[PDB]
Amino acid sequence: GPKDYYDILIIGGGPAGLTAAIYAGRAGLSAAVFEKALEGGAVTQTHVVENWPGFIRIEGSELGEKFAEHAKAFGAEIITAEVLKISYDNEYKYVELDNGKKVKGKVLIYATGAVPRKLGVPGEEEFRGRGVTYCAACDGYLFSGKDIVVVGGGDSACDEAHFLAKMVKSITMVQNLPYLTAAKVLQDRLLENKNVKVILNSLVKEIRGKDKVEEVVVVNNETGEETVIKAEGVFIYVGLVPKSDLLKGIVDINEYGYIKTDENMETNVPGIYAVGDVREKNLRQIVTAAADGAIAVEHAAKKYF
Amino acid sequence: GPKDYYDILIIGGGPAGLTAAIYAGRAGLSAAVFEKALEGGAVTQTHVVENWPGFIRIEGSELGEKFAEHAKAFGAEIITAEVLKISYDNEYKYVELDNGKKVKGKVLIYATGAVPRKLGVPGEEEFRGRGVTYCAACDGYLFSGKDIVVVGGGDSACDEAHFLAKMVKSITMVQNLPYLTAAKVLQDRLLENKNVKVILNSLVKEIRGKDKVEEVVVVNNETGEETVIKAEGVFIYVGLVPKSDLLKGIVDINEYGYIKTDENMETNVPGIYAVGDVREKNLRQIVTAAADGAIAVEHAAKKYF
Numbered sequence: 382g383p384k385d386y387y388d389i390l391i392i393g394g395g396p397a398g399l400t401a402a403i404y405a406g407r408a409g410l411s412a413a414v415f416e417k418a419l420e421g422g423a424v425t426q427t428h429v430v431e432n433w434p435g436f437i438r439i440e441g442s443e444l445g446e447k448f449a450e451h452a453k454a455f456g457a458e459i460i461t462a463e464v465l466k467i468s469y470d471n472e473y474k475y476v477e478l479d480n481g482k483k484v485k486g487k488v489l490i491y492a493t494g495a496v497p498r499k500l501g502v503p504g505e506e507e508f509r510g511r512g513v514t515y516c517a518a519c520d521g522y523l524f525s526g527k528d529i530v531v532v533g534g535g536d537s538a539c540d541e542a543h544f545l546a547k548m549v550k551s552i553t554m555v556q557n558l559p560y561l562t563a564a565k566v567l568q569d570r571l572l573e574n575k576n577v578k579v580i581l582n583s584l585v586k587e588i589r590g591k592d593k594v595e596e597v598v599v600v601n602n603e604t605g606e607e608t609v610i611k612a613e614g615v616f617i618y619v620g621l622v623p624k625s626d627l628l629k630g631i632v633d634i635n636e637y638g639y640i641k642t643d644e645n646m647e648t649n650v651p652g653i654y655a656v657g658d659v660r661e662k663n664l665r666q667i668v669t670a671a672a673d674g675a676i677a678v679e680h681a682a683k684k685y686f
Numbered sequence: 687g688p689k690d691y692y693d694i695l696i697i698g699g700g701p702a703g704l705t706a707a708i709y710a711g712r713a714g715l716s717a718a719v720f721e722k723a724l725e726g727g728a729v730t731q732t733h734v735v736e737n738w739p740g741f742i743r744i745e746g747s748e749l750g751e752k753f754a755e756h757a758k759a760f761g762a763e764i765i766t767a768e769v770l771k772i773s774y775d776n777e778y779k780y781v782e783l784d785n786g787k788k789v790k791g792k793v794l795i796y797a798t799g800a801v802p803r804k805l806g807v808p809g810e811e812e813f814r815g816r817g818v819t820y821c822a823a824c825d826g827y828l829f830s831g832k833d834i835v836v837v838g839g840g841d842s843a844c845d846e847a848h849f850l851a852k853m854v855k856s857i858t859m860v861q862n863l864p865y866l867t868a869a870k871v872l873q874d875r876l877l878e879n880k881n882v883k884v885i886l887n888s889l890v891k892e893i894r895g896k897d898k899v900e901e902v903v904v905v906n907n908e909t910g911e912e913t914v915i916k917a918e919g920v921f922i923y924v925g926l927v928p929k930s931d932l933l934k935g936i937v938d939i940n941e942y943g944y945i946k947t948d949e950n951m952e953t954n955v956p957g958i959y960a961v962g963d964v965r966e967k968n969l970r971q972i973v974t975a976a977a978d979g980a981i982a983v984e985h986a987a988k989k990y991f
Contacts, residue, residue, distance in 0.1 A: 435741065437756050451739055522711075644968065672973045679823060
């Protein structure tokens with residue numbers, strides 16, 4: 382049940398948006414968080430979070446809820462709804478929800494995240510959090526001393542494989558094309574890592590295990606031959622998808638779908654900011670999303686009110 | 687008891703350095719945190735923290751300790767020592783401590799913070815956390831509906847007074863010069879705030895109260911006349927001092943003492959990064975310091991190891 386007006390409209394209820402909500406409430410500003418799925422965002426889809434300072438080891442779903450409760454403690458209203466359209470006039474911003482309701486605000490914080498592309502193979506969903514992950518920074522440590530697979534051969538896959546090789550026993554990369562697509566510099570760093578092996582022109586067919594991941598079945602695109610790779614973890618890096626379509630044609634977006642902003646997180650449209658993983662940036666973590674949300678609201682609190 | 691070598695040397699144990707330590711441990715890298723005072727940094731000198739996502743209201747000292755315990759949980763070693771000198775060669779960095787010990791590392795993360803200038807008047811120390819504060823973003827909300835004083839008349843004082851005016855009942859600014867020194871744009875925003883009053887050419891003589899702040903005594907520089915201002919809070923903004931002297935002559939520092947860095951937090955010296963409040967930036971908060979520490983270590987983990 383949203384009201385007609387809020388000082389700040391926040392699209393997305395992941396760490397970026399929820400931090401923005403916390404900062405908005407503690408700036409004396411009314412705020413609405415529109416979240417189509419689960420409050421907490423991607424955190425709710427991770428097993429344990431070990432890199433949110435202050436919590437040594439906490440379940441992602443629990444942390445996400447802590448974030449949502451914190452935002453509500455200070456006044457923000459979390460609304461379960463999908464935002465379908467965004468528009469703006471001289472000084473107000475508007476959103477239309479999937480329930481027909483239209484909401485007005487002075488400022489809009491866009492925090493829709495960026496979703497990892499999936500493999501779409503058996504075992505991928507089943508083992509999420511039990512060997513299957515899409516974030517090396519987040520979970521790599523958990524795989525120290527283990528054999529793992531990294532799927533993909535682009536910038537992210539090669540960059541994160543290099544990162545992981547310092548901790549994991551071995552990496553088998555599975556790349557679909559007959560070559561790696563990552564920048565040479567990124568590929569060059571991988572050659573330092575003798576505990577890394579690359580399998581080209583192949584796809585993951587299935588991910589198998591009992592309680593946790595135990596094997597990955599790979600199939601060659603040319604021959605169809607199948608190989609069984611023993612592994613305890615699968616890090617998937619076959620692409621990321623920023624959820625910026627609501628702002629396509631409204632704000633400057635880069636070639637890959639990520640929203641451009643200045644140092645205050647502001648887009649080229651006054652009063653519209655982009656925070657967290659949907660923004661053009663290098664490191665997508667809970668702490669960098671939180672920092673973006675803080676920066677944006679602090680700046681807006683002073684500039685537009 | 688430090689060892690001779692660590693992959694990463696972190697100078698300062700506030701949120702920036704401790705986050706860097708957490709990320710370093712979870713990247714498979716040995717890390718030393720050198721902290722001359724209290725682990726947690728400035729957080730330990732604040733009453734309650736309400737803007738660290740996940741904790742609705744927590745005592746600063748408790749939060750700081752949580753940060754330190756988290757860094758240690760993942761391998762970092764916190765060393766109580768003051769770093770007195772920093773040097774570097776082809777690929778290593780070195781620090782000399784106040785105990786004579788010299789420590790080597792591959793990478794150095796500089797996270798020494800920025801200290802607010804003090805008034806040096808009676809009541810300032812006594813009432814810290816009970817009405818006296820140096821951070822509007824952090825504590826402003828706690829003063830909703832209250833009468834407060836803001837000391838200073840520069841960019842920060844005018845910017846934060848504007849921020850506070852949305853929540854507090856009234857602001858009396860006390861500026862020492864016969865004029866405000868803030869940029870006109872910042873001064874202009876204050877004129878929107880009719881709940882704000884400015885007293886020029888004056889100094890705070892004393893801050894008084896019982897359990898909490900109750901009054902501020904002001905004295906005019908010209909006449910010496912004293913005025914008693916009823917107030918429950920005192921926000922001091924008479925300058926900030928970045929602790930960058932260890933790197934003066936080593937890295938590019940701006941006109942005001944803040945260290946310059948690229949988007950990866952790296953200085954103009956390879957392998958040396960600056961994170962948190964000592965860096966050139968706009969918003970100095972726990973979350974932006976944490977984000978800097980994460981960014982720096984993630985980048986170094988891939989580039990230098």
